[PDB]
Amino acid sequence: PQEEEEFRRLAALPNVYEVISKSIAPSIFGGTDMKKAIACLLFGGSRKRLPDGLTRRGDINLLMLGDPGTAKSQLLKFVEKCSPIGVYTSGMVLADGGVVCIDEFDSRCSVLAAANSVFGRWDETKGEDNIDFMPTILSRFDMIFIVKDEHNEERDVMLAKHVITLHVSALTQTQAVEGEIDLAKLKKFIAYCRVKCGPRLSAEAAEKLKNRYIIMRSGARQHERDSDRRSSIPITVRQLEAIVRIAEALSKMKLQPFATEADVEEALRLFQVSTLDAA
């Protein structure tokens, strides 16, 4: 019962999103957007039934592509550890409402998938044809992220220093950097938020997302026509549903009964940065 008050106090802060994002794998350097996406995936959306009997997915599916050594398996292991229900596979029935991590990609379950480039390493000049998955199976994933080995001398120095600092200070002290939540506390908070309530969108946010979806579809059309080539990542109504789910999850994180325009804007920004850069 006291943990209810603790969770209410934690979720009433104006900076719950930043604290949760920092709580997602503080050991791994960088990837703030990826950490935020992982957090909102862990929170997840809400499922809704209809009088006609049809059901709509209330879970988010994500796909990751990148060169080896970008710390993907570590992220999957952290997600499996943090989630109340988690399954890790090398490439469904036992998981109900949890998260299933699938490595080497080449039932109410959220799917987090990681895969490698077709040639082993990404080719920037060639552009497309670096993904072997068909567009039909690619459309199921809500967001697709691309990671490349950004070779910077100072970034390599910083990465080495961060790794060595973790190695050295790891045995000495195990403390939160800046207000990071403990693993058990974060797990219980996520479970409480998922069990308690689920929010819904508003009319103004709906209209804004409608206009943005129409503009994005027109832009994707124009890019496909000018490029004279079929994009491997099409945009359909499922993308709109995914953005709605992400906005609802963002509203769910604050336990508000009605979603706000800020959640929709953040969901649109994340969807842009992932899919449009990927496409």
Binding site: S27, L166, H167, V168, S169, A170, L171, T174
Partner: peptide, 10 residues
């Protein structure tokens, strides 16, 4: 062999 922080084992 080393196990820095009990997070990863070297």
């Amino acid at each position: 062999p080393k196990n820095p922080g009990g997070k990863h084992k070297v």
